[PDB]
Amino acid sequence: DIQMTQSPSSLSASVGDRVTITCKASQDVSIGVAWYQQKPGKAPKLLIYSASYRYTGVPSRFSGSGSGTDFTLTISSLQPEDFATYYCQQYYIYPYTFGQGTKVEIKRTVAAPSVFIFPPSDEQLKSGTASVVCLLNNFYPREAKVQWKVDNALQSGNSQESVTEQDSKDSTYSLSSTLTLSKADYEKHKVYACEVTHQGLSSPVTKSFNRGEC
Amino acid sequence: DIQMTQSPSSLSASVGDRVTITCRASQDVNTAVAWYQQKPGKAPKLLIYSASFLYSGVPSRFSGSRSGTDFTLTISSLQPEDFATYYCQQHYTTPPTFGQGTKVEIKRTVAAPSVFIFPPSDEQLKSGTASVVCLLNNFYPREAKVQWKVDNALQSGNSQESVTEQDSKDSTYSLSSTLTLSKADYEKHKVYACEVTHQGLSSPVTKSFNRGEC
Amino acid sequence: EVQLVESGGGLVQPGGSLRLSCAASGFTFTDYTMDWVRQAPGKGLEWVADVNPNSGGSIYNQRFKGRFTLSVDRSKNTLYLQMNSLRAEDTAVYYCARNLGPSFYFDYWGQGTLVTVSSASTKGPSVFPLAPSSKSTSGGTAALGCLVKDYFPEPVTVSWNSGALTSGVHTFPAVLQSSGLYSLSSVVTVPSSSLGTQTYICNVNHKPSNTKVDKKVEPKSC
Amino acid sequence: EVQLVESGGGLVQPGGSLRLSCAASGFNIKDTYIHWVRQAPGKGLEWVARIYPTNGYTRYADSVKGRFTISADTSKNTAYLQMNSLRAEDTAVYYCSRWGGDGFYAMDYWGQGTLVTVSSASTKGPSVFPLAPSSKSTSGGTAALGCLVKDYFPEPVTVSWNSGALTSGVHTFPAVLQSSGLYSLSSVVTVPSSSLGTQTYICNVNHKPSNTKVDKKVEP
Amino acid sequence: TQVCTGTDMKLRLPASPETHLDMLRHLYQGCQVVQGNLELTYLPTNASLSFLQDIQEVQGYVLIAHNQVRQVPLQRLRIVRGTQLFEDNYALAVLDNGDPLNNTTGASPGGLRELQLRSLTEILKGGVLIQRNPQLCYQDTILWKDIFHKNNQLALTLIDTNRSRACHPCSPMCKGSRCWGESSEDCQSLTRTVCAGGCARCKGPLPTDCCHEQCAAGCTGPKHSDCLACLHFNHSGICELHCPALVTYNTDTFESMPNPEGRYTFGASCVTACPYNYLSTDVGSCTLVCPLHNQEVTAEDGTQRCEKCSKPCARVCYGLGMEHLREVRAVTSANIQEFAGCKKIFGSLAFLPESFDGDPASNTAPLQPEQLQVFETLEEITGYLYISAWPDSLPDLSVFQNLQVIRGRILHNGAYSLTLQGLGISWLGLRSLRELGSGLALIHHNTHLCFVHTVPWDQLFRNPHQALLHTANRPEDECVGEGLACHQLCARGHCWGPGPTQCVNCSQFLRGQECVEECRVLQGLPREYVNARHCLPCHPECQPQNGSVTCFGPEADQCVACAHYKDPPFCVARCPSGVKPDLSYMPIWKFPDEEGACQPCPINCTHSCVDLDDKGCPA
Ligand SMILES: *[C@@H]1O[C@H](CO)[C@@H](O[C@@H]2O[C@H](CO)[C@@H](O[C@@H]3O[C@H](CO)[C@@H](O)[C@H](O[C@H]4O[C@H](CO)[C@@H](O)[C@H](O)[C@@H]4O)[C@@H]3O)[C@H](O)[C@H]2NC(C)=O)[C@H](O)[C@H]1NC(C)=O
Ligand SMILES: *[C@@H]1O[C@H](CO)[C@@H](O)[C@H](O)[C@H]1NC(C)=O
Ligand SMILES: *[C@@H]1O[C@H](CO)[C@@H](O)[C@H](O)[C@H]1NC(C)=O
Ligand SMILES: *[C@@H]1O[C@H](CO)[C@@H](O)[C@H](O)[C@H]1NC(C)=O
Ligand SMILES: *[C@@H]1O[C@H](CO)[C@@H](O)[C@H](O)[C@H]1NC(C)=O
Ligand SMILES: *[C@@H]1O[C@H](CO)[C@@H](O)[C@H](O)[C@H]1NC(C)=O
């Protein structure tokens, strides 16, 4: 293996942007280079062989460049068809090593998450899986430092989120994080909270319910 | 085709002296003659174009002439840096020939050798490669008489002769006088014999040490 | 033109083995060397193997040395790919592709498939509603849905009143929980004043389980 | 400046085949005649061949008549030399040159030359071995320090005086005929009694047929 | 060669059906393995066809249609495979044979009457079709599923058994009703039905009679080196699953080491190298077209190889049928733009009638003959050459003067490579043409066309099979009522057209493209030297001595001397003085000698030597 170093792992842009993402290798493989685009839930497609040559059918806006280990991939002008994870790859060294992927979103205006907590149910009161949902919706940008809490301290280890593949209409984020606990774990405390912080708004807002507040 | 005599091919003189070179043609070649200079490790660079014209970018200590088939390159003043192998050629017909390669030295006094020895160690004392290295200095000229003073044996075919590039401290050269037999000699005779004889030695000089000195 | 057909993706327990089939068409079969490449879900690509239709030489990973074997049928232009024992490290979508250059790189790509490595058998979804309370609803445009817990295998068909209204619908990508089970959540944003009369019914069917789920949402107070 | 590059030559098997090169600088060979002149090392010069690249018409010496073929790429503006059927006495120093000027039928501008010492490729290099250094028994007033190059065919030389920081007078014991065509000329420098023990005598010969770096100095 | 190429002309009537028979007789003579399709069409009862007996196997399929013979000589045919199929559905079709109720009182007008495919044992793919053949017996009693492959049973079979005559049965020397035909030589053998269990091929009821698993056509002894024709391959009598490996690996680094034991692939055969008009491959195949990013390079011996371009491979011009024109029959006014300066066209060239009077509906121009001047760099054609129409302004095919070789990989009707018909012109003018890699040459139905019999066709083929097809053209006795033939100087009278520019091999000299008697050495004003029967001027200075000449090579310094002046080694009629430096010195004002030496100036400037004792050097 040679460390395929794509920077970034994700970004966002507008229509018609010369954006360069490079995959510097940790060992000189300067000729045998591959480049790929894979759509979500689709096959990949070849982009550039040997880091210099556009393939038949690859449109004009692409540009394979860069030798040494610094290997230049550059869409000169972004199109809505180009929102896809891309890949660097060598073929100079056995065994043959892909990159790690770089997602492309659109840049637009940041937004307010629809921040909502979720109390449990009565068929859950016969089930036992104390699944509390921290629900967020319709915001921007990508990352949101969100975590759970217990009464003044955190809650970690056993909670799971659910990101969305992004819209093309307005490209707004939605997420449900579900802390799943036991029934005795619900019957242990009162205040279970959600540590919602995001750049699309300003103040660190916490929305929660309680045991008696239910 | 064409013969281009250079008589002689080597000569010695002093700094600040007239030069007389005999470049002899062979046929009805009329004019198209060029002179050349190259120092050891260099390119053959023009002295006289058009058989009478010194080439530009070069100082005018030179001289050109024309007489029959013996056309003469002349420098008014020999210099120590003005020192090479010297050449004359034609371009009257294809092929562009050459002269034999004549040479100008810096003369000194007929002198004596110096005091040096290099035998190897015991790893090169087992089987047939004897470096009886008799390094010399200061003697003059190259032209020598040939006799041998090597270990009371007849020497007809041991001759690995030598002369060097002239460093002109006293026209320094270094002649070589060696011997080669079964090399397993660390216990019999780890040293050997040398003496170099020349024209006007008023100082017979050689060197080889004696046994027991590693 | 150059297209591929892949088959063989199913379910196994950790330990067994399985065949594959990559059908090829529309090109000279003996002038390109079909290979295999995988990708882990939510993770990167990975090269698997390499073989000519000339020797049958399974040229593949040292990391997977001796574990998978290639058998071609160039009479039917179709190669098989065998399996071996592992413990869910290779639960990956498997891509058939042709070595476009005759070194190691690719242009075409099959539709591919994943093989599930699990000793856990199927399960219907544990039905739960994603009902916010009567107080903790939005001021005018609410949001609610159904929780799709603990089903197996993938994938499901979630809709609302047979897919009536997609205005603010949110069916999320599923996750596999720590007890190994797939689950997801699916909600929809409706106006809050419409909730006084209108109530939507989540239609969630899973055809390998062959069981549908119909459920509507009530903001029950405590 | 007209500047040329001669690269690629060296020891090949007798009978080898190779395209050499000669690259222009600040001119064009559209109006220039190109040449090659071999020279046996330390011997006389000898014209070989010539081209006019607009029409590629060739002349030759009779010793290389019909065997070699001159070639050039004026679109690359980079003249070449395809060599063919290398012989016994092809061991010579090549150089590329010009006839820039319709009156100027002279070759004063050159490149650098790459030595083409094609022969049977004897695989052996030198043997450099120490002594006991002192200053007691000087027969006169001068002792010795150096590294001589023996047992080698052809001549690559890497005899160092602290990585080539003292290039003062590598002497010459001009290369003699050993058994398999192996050679012996000096690199033992004539020294005064001043450089004894001031600098070490470390010499490591990167003898391209063998890389015979005897990591060892002669130390008298 | 035991291996040859089939044809592709499914149910089309032939081009020249009078001569169409003897096309086959040159083609399928002594060949055992067919790379194509055995297509036997429109054959009358007079056809002595016994040359078909040496045929063992067809890789493609076998079609027999519309003939008038009683029996066919196809009896050593062991097995068919069916790489291709007929109508994607059939591998052996015998259709429409005999006579379909015309106005013709004949006793045996034809129709294949028995199977008599005596050596046929297995069939891999496809279906079997028998329709519309009144003169057949013995076909119904045949168990096809044995002849079908066991592991390949796409068992569509339509055998129309409407007969028109009485069929007395076969010999009762057969074990049952299983018979090729009426002789006792003609019984249907068995390799699956009497076989049983895990045995797929057996030569008798014993398990010892069960054949080796790699053996398609049955076995003699029970080893793999004993069989009749093998399933996947045939490497030197050993029926391997694969051709041996062409590279040896580290098994750890997989480092590439060239195994010399390996072979290449070619159809049913593992062979060391590829045959003549084929391509060696990095994977080790012998194909027609290089794969992608792979250049058919000029190999060292001529046995070509596809190899990887480091850079992009160049835009090599696609002809008909390849990658841009895979359906277009003719050449239009539109596609003809692509051939600008092309010299090795990948693809064919077809000259239809509609090539020249273009459709205004499918709105193309009727072609201009002036546009045909684009084909004049053309060296080599991989495709074939169909010519059916030609301008009446041109008596020739002089557009193709420069064309050396036609490999003819893709063949016309699956068979043909040079197609000339329906023109009326008198000669061709193919002065560079020297080699046809495969295929046949057909020339027919042309009015004035002489000179073809003069063409020395022996130098133009690479098998002992491919002959010329002259018929239906200008008579030879009328070609000497012309009084014209090959010229005096043609070597053994071998010429393309009429006159001095037309000989195949000249006898004396080459003045451009004109073999001449002598060249101006000692006779004329533009004197020309000799370069191994090539006559070229000097830079115009072999000032013709009465008996001699003055600069041999066109570099103007060699025969003897100068003419007016000397700039040594060269000569001028006036000593020039240029301005364009490239180094700051001009040719400074060279004064002539008495004996012509234009000699330059002593002083730099301002003082002397402006050739007239005057001024003229600036500053
Ligand atoms: C598999 O490949 C092998 C080699 O790669 C090859 O075997 C060939 O088999 C044929 C048939 O046995 C051989 O041909 C024979 O040659 C001898 C020598 O000339 C002839 O005497 C034989 O004559 C018989 O057939 C004649 C046909 O004209 C009759 O006139 C005659 O009376 C005999 O009946 C026969 O022609 C051939 O030598 C070998 N080897 C090669 C290199 O071709 C064949 O391609 C495949 N064999 C199998 C069993 O699949
Ligand atoms: C074909 O053969 C038959 C006899 O079988 C003969 O009568 C007939 O004339 C032949 N055909 C021609 C065209 O001669
Ligand atoms: C055979 O002939 C009959 C009568 O013409 C017609 O049905 C058809 O051609 C054939 N039918 C069958 C069943 O083969
Ligand atoms: C032409 O004939 C001559 C006869 O001397 C022969 O030497 C030459 O090779 C022939 N050339 C060609 C192209 O056939
Ligand atoms: C050759 O002779 C003719 C007359 O016989 C004369 O005019 C001419 O000058 C001569 N020389 C040549 C052609 O060089
Ligand atoms: C000598 O003459 C040349 C051309 O006539 C000119 O370019 C050059 O400058 C002159 N030399 C000097 C020193 O000016």
Author numbering:
A (entry chain B), B (entry chain D): 1 to 214
C (entry chain C): 1 to 52, 52A, 53 to 82, 82A, 82B, 82C, 83 to 99, 99A, ...
D (entry chain E): 1 to 220
E (entry chain A): 23 to 126, 130 to 644
Wording from the paper:
Human epidermal growth factor receptors (HER) are a family of 4 transmembrane tyrosine kinase receptors that can dimerize with one another and mediate cell growth, differentiation, and survival. Structural studies have shown that the extracellular domain (ECD) of the HER family of receptors is composed of four subdomains (I-IV), and that the ECD can only exist in two forms: a tethered form and an extended form. HER2 is unique in that it exists in a constitutively extended form due to stabilization through direct interactions between subdomains I and III, explaining both why HER2 is a preferred binding partner for other HER family members and contributing to its importance in tumor development. Over-expression of HER2 has been shown to correlate with aggressive tumors, making it a key target for development of anti-cancer agents.
The development of pertuzumab, a monoclonal antibody targeting subdomain II of the HER2 ECD is one such treatment, designed to block heterodimerization as well as homodimerization to more completely inhibit HER2 signaling. All three components of the ternary complex were identified in the cryo-EM map, and a final model of HER2-trastuzumab-pertuzumab was built and refined. Residues Thr23-Ala644 of HER2 were defined in the cryo-EM map except T127-V129 contained within a loop region. However, the constant region of trastuzumab Fab has poor density compared to its variable region and the other two components of the complex, indicating its flexibility in solution. It appears from the cryo-EM structure of HER2-trastuzumab-pertuzumab that, even with the flexibility of the hinge region and the flexibility between the variable and the constant regions, the two Fab arms of one bispecific antibody cannot bind to both domains II and IV of one HER2 molecule simultaneously, considering all the various conformations of IgG1.
